[PDB]
TrEMBL record, chains B, C:
Name of this protein: NOP5/NOP56 related protein
Pfam families assigned: Nop (PF01798), Nop5_56-rel_N_Arc (PF21572)
Organism whose genome encodes this protein: Pyrococcus furiosus (strain ATCC 43587 / DSM 3638 / JCM 8422 / Vc1)
Domain Nop residue range list: 249-364
UniProt-listed InterPro entries: Helix_hairpin_bin_sf, Nop56/Nop58, Nop5_56-rel_N, Nop5_N_sf, Nop_C, Nop_dom, Nop_dom_sf, NOSIC
GO CC terms in record: box C/D methylation guide snoRNP complex
RNA sequence: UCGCCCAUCAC
RNA sequence: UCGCCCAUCAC
RNA sequence: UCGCCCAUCAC
RNA sequence: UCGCCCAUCAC
């Protein structure tokens, strides 16, 4: 279990955020990998960010939670970087993924944001 | 005038009488390593200020390069190894140190000789966590083999088990004394037992209830005690490693890109915080000066690299690889900054090995 | 709970009264940049440990990352920027620093703005030497133009020459006066002259034997004095440059290869004297270990390289380049080790440029 | 003026050290350049060592004087690295030259060693 | 090609 | 049970 | 391809 | 009085 987590979660919200990546990818606008996540994070444009629980070394994503406080955007975690890469359609892994436009998934990303604002508190 | 020693540093006159001597204010094994290889130390700065304030100037030392650091710093220093200070102090320490002087020579000399080898592991906090588990697993095997040793030896002399409960003292009894009819009052003091413990044990020599081991039955129980003795020496080998290696600290950027380049890159980002927040795509172009300006303002081609061009595998290198290496360097640099800033652990020789695999693959591809 | 400003460090309670205050034990900009960017320093560390001795267990600071380091230091730490310690100090600074407070804020704000950029020379002492030669050359040309300024202004006020001996006081007088009827008690007392010196000058202005320069002429002599006060300001910028430049001092081996190789070459030569006494054609093979040993004992294959193998152009390049770079690197290292032992003066950016150039030559060759 | 020229050299013996290099060149045993000087200055029995007066940085040869004081060997110097290379018989430069056997130069090395030992005293 | 010191063990 | 020579590829 | 702050030289 | 681009070459 990594250092950078701020609140506990079950598979609840996390399986729904992985499901949101699986439909934002081909109905909306998305980027994958942590330096593209970090570009869309630093210049604000990522509406939701998803990070892995098994990054190794763990330190490469450790900026994404406090930097999402500094710019005021919601953030969430998921249990394996290879499965996050496969949800983002690529054949390697991804330590993080960024949503720029939810496409069809707006009510779903708004549920995730509204329920993550119960935990960032 | 000066003489150079383990039991502090000493000053003597032209006639060979003592003036003053002073004791050290850092760990004496590190103070001797400096003074023996010819660089001067804070307690000798104070002794030569004492010698100056007494009204002497003719500061003859034993060593040439200690005398170099002295006159290079500004002192009135010269050199003669057989000078009257060393010719007195090393002829009879009894007049100056006290009669047990050889204990103080011994305890620092063996420490200096154990210390005269340099250290550079790649991820040493992890390579010491495994020694903390080795200390947990070493007491775990001792607390297993000594249970077998207790249960087997208590067939022959059970009057000892509840009386020597601290496991090393029971192992030393079974190793060194061994067979129960060897037991006498003198060998128990040669084992370090007290009179209060020696009234017991000897109480049982005439009246024990144990059943007989013969001369080479007790031998395999002694072999087990002789190998468990080495597991206590292995516990010392781990204790002496932990006391040396668990005090280490090293920055990652300082090893991955070198101190001066790391320190520069931290300021083109505004700070180490920013170098630990920013993306590799921006860390790639930090401090490119007017090449970044004309890429933004005039719409030119993006710069391939900023201040990372001073990296010792980009600066000399041919064009085919300079861009490919700059991209992977900016990623591995962003990782090293995140480790130094969020974690404060060291992995920099792993981060180098990965960029070195990518550079070998760049040769193997192009 | 705790807050910091230009002159010190302050703890206030959750009702709103002062518990303790400290001032910095190093120059304020140098400590405040660390506390501003988000990292801990010894003076804030001693205050927060005083609050821990006084029995406070929970802490509230201003900066999110200083708060992050405070919990990593072992404290119940959090962040709230509007808290009473900072809110009081920034609302009523005249209560804590008095009715001049903005002058100390100014004196450190401009110094922090002079500090928030990196400083790294290849020739810092040679730049200081040219600044020292510039300081004698500037004073020497000030003396030259002051000799012309004395002679030319003596056409229009000849009584002044014996009366103002101090050269910058003559320059600033002619700069601000220009024509001799702009002389008043007020401007001489602003220029800081004594009531005695002002009892003359004015007495001479009413009776002078000098000629007449027009308004169109005397402004040329005023411009000559103004450009000499430009030169006197440059004189201070040279003195203040050297007062900074004498902080950037460093060893060469740390820049040419860095600690992983520098401390290895020192340890495999046994010490830095011994490394400086070694040839390039042994520095090449220091820490070849088993390869040097059997090249001697059994007459085996000569070692191509020792501990230098992990250099930025050896373990990552074609065999053609691996052998040629090893001895060229050992040449430049044999220079660098002799520099760092015998003189300690910094040249390592040129030692880098030569090893860029010889590896570029190995590139045009191979 | 560099820190390694620790005694004032007269209008004599300097040309005799240059001549000692010239005639050892085909008749003695000899090394040239400062790292080869360094190893033949540590190892075996060197007889004499020669340095240039214009070596820059001075630090590269600044080790040779204290290295001669540890091991009882004489040293001397000549006005130029380009002339010292030409004396050794190479068309580049040399910062120093070392004599392992004098060949013809043996009476020159004996005169230089006798006169320098009483000069520095 | 040729030697010198070193731990640990044998036929 | 083990070594040596020559030819050859990747870095 | 475009925005603003800003020095310096000039009409 | 000032600027750009294709092909080829190099670190």
């Amino acid at each position: 279990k990594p250092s950078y987590v701020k609140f506990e979660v079950p598979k609840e919200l996390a399986e729904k955020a992985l499901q949101a990546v699986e439909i934002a990818r081909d109905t909306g606008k998305i980027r994958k990998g942590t330096n593209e996540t970090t570009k869309a994070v630093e210049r604000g444009q990522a509406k939701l960010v998803i990070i892995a629980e098994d990054v190794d070394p763990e330190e490469i994503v450790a900026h994404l939670p406090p930097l999402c406080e500094e710019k005021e955007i919601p953030y969430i975690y998921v249990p394996s970087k290879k499965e996050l890469g496969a949800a983002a359609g690529i054949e390697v892994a991804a330590a993080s993924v960024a949503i720029i436009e939810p496409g069809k998934a707006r009510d779903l990303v708004e549920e995730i944001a509204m329920k993550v604002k119960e935990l960032m508190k | 005038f000066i003489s150079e020693n383990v039991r502090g540093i000493y000053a003597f006159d032209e006639n060979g009488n003592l003036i003053e001597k002073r004791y050290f204010t850092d760990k004496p094994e590190k103070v001797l390593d400096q003074l023996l290889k010819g660089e001067i130390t804070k307690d000798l700065e104070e002794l030569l200020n004492s010698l100056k304030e007494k009204g002497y100037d003719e500061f003859v030392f034993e060593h040439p390069e200690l005398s170099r650091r002295a006159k290079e710093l500004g002192f009135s220093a010269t050199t003669e190894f057989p000078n009257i200070a060393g010719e007195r102090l090393r002829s009879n320490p009894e007049e100056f140190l006290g009669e047990n002087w050889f204990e103080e020579y011994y305890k620092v000399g063996v420490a200096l000789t154990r210390m005269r080898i340099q250290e550079q592991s790649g991820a040493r906090d992890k390579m010491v966590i495994q020694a903390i588990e080795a200390l947990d697993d070493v007491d775990k095997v001792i607390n297993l083999l000594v249970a077998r040793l207790r249960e087997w030896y208590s067939l022959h002399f059970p009057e000892l088990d509840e009386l020597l409960p601290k496991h090393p003292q029971y192992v030393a009894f079974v190793k060194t004394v061994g067979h129960r009819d060897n037991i006498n009052e003198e060998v128990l003091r040669e084992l370090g037992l007290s009179e209060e413990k020696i009234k017991k044990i000897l109480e049982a020599k005439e009246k024990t209830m144990g059943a007989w081991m013969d001369q080479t039955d007790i031998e395999v129980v002694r072999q087990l005690a002789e190998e468990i003795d080495r597991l206590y020496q292995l516990r010392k080998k781990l204790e002496d490693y932990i006391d040396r290696a668990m005090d280490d600290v090293a920055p990652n950027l300082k090893a991955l890109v070198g101190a001066k380049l790391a320190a520069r890159l931290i300021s083109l980002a505004g700070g180490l915080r920013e170098l630990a927040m920013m993306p590799s795509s921006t860390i790639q172009v930090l401090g490119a000066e007017k090449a970044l300006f004309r890429h933004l303002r005039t719409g030119a081609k993006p710069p391939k690299h900023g201040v990372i061009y001073q990296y010792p595998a980009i600066n000399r290198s041919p064009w085919w690889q300079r861009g490919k290496i700059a991209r992977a360097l900016a990623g591995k640099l962003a990782i090293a900054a995140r480790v130094d800033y969020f974690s404060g652990e060291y992995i920099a020789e792993e981060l180098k090995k990965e960029l070195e695999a990518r550079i070998r693959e760049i040769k193997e591809k192009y």
